[PDB]
Ligand binder design. Structure first.
Ligand SMILES: CC(=O)N1CCN(C(=O)[C@H](Cc2cccc(C(=N)N)c2)NS(=O)(=O)c2ccc3ccccc3c2)CC1
Ligand SMILES: [Ca+2]
Length: 223
């Protein structure tokens, strides 16, 4: 997260860290046994880390559970990043409490202007590489589809939305991928892509979760 702030230990209880000997992506706990992330984060040998703040120290409240299966959306395109969504089933159910809780799926799409909270352990520098120990947060509004498409001509599909600041300096970045974009207590987006990080007139593009609610539910019901 570039231009964000330290969230505070366990203030984003649904935030998940995808680990394979190091943190590579974020995710969101949608129920005791299912995590939603980005398809481009797919990797074998995934350990899901719940209740995390400092990802390098065992401080208490953590829960490490192996992923039993990772379901990448069947129509995911690695070139366009369209349908950039993946579901992860936990080997065991997570112990829900005050510091580990699930986030609600949207019942409707969010409109332009809505302020959302984006979080993660990704890169914090626009020009360079710096990874934090603790979780960073960023509040950013959803932009208009016209603006989004003016920024990324021919690359924005109906399953994506832009969020952030056109002036630059505040945006999600590498390592944040798969993480949550929560608006009004509902998971509206998943950190997907963007041209660089925090660049002028290049906001972040996120997977439009409201278009996948039925898919998620059906897929979960059948697995
Ligand atoms: C591995 C992976 O899928 N990806 C896709 C997602 N990737 C990126 O978007 C990267 C870094 C990144 C990651 C997450 C959010 C942002 C943001 N600006 N909000 C930027 N930005 S980039 O300019 O290097 C970039 C942009 C679009 C891309 C589209 C396809 C492939 C690579 C791409 C790289 C990481 C590699
Ligand atoms: Ca820790």
């Amino acid at each position: 997260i570039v231009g964000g702030y330290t969230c505070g230990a366990n203030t984003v209880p649904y935030q998940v860290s995808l680990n394979s000997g190091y943190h590579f992506c974020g995710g969101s706990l949608i129920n005791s046994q299912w995590v939603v992330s980005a398809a481009h984060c797919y990797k074998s040998g995934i350990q899901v880390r719940l209740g995390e703040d400092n990802i390098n120290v065992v401080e208490g409240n953590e829960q490490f559970i192996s992923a039993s299966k990772s379901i990448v959306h069947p129509s995911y395109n690695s070139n366009t990043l369209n349908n950039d969504i993946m579901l992860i089933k936990l080997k065991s159910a997570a112990s829900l409490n005050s510091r580990v809780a699930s986030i609600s799926l949207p019942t409707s799409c969010a409109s332009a202007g809505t302020q959302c909270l984006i979080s993660g352990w990704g890169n914090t520098k626009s020009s360079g590489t710096s990874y934090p120990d603790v979780l960073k947060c960023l509040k950013a509004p959803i932009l208009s589809d016209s603006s989004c498409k003016s920024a990324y001509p021919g690359q924005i599909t109906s399953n994506m939305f832009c969020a952030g600041y056109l002036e630059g300096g505040k945006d999600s970045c590498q390592g944040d991928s798969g993480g949550p974009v929560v608006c009004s207590g509902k998971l509206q987006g998943i950190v997907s892509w963007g041209s660089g990080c925090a660049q002028k007139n290049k906001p972040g593009v996120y997977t439009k979760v409201c278009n996948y609610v039925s898919w998620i539910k059906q897929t979960i019901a059948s697995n």
